[PDB]
Amino acid sequence: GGEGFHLHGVQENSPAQQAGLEPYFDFIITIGHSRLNKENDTLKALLKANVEKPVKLEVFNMKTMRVREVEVVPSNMWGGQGLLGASVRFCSFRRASEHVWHVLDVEPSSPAALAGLRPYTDYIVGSDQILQESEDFFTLIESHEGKPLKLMVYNSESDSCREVTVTPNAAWGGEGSLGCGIGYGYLHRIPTQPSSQYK
Ligand SMILES: [Cl-]
Numbered sequence: 001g002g003e004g005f006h007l008h009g010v011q012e013n014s015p016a017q018q019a020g021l022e023p024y025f026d027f028i029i030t031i032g033h034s035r036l037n038k039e040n041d042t043l044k045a046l047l048k049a050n051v052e053k054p055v056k057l058e059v060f061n062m063k064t065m066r067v068r069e070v071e072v073v074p075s076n077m078w079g080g081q082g083l084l085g086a087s088v089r090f091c092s093f094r095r096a097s098e099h100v101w102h103v104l105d106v107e108p109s110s111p112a113a114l115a116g117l118r119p120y121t122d123y124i125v126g127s128d129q130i131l132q133e134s135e136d137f138f139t140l141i142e143s144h145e146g147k148p149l150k151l152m153v154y155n156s157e158s159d160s161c162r163e164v165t166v167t168p169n170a171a172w173g174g175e176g177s178l179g180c181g182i183g184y185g186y187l188h189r190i191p192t193q194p195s196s197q198y199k
């Protein structure tokens with residue numbers, strides 16, 4: 001299960017952002033006594049019912065696996081698109097688990113190397129382009145041949161996210177347009193064990 005409005009993006013200065021809702025890692029599973037365990041308009045409607053008013057959400061986090069309660073004020077005042085200001089998709093917790101791309105070896109002077117992608121510790125988790133192609137990460141790379149592309153990246157060392165901009169270049173001198181390995185599935189998901197640097 002299987003049941004949440006998964007965050008795929010959060011707008012700058014949004015109510016979502018101000019309440020600490022985080023892209024990829026967070027699911028909105030409940031708004032005011034209503035459990036969002038079905039693909040319907042309840043979240044959208046209850047956000048609207050509480051416009052300019054504080055309402056509490058129950059939020060599930062992929063990394064922590066805990067539910068936390070968060071307070072949000074949906075609003076038409078903050079300047080961006082939407083009352084919440086987050087891009088949301090109804091996703092299973094399992095699907096989200098699998099939609100992560102582990103950076104493997106990085107070729108010394110590759111576009112990936114120029115972009116600062118870190119071998120084995122960087123994990124690609126999103127892109128702020130949910131326009132009309134934000135499907136596969138590989139699909140995304142092929143369409144930005146010769147074009148800068150903004151990635152959301154998680155790093156297992158810092159245990160935090162950052163925005164990476166990379167220009168895929170099929171003519172860079174190696175094979176691929178990225179010039180790094182990408183790992184998927186078994187042994188390539190977000191680590192559950194903390195990294196060696198304690199803390
Ligand atoms: Cl997902």
Ligand SMILES: [Zn+2]
Pocket residue numbers: 006007008089090091095096
């Ligand atoms: Zn999702």
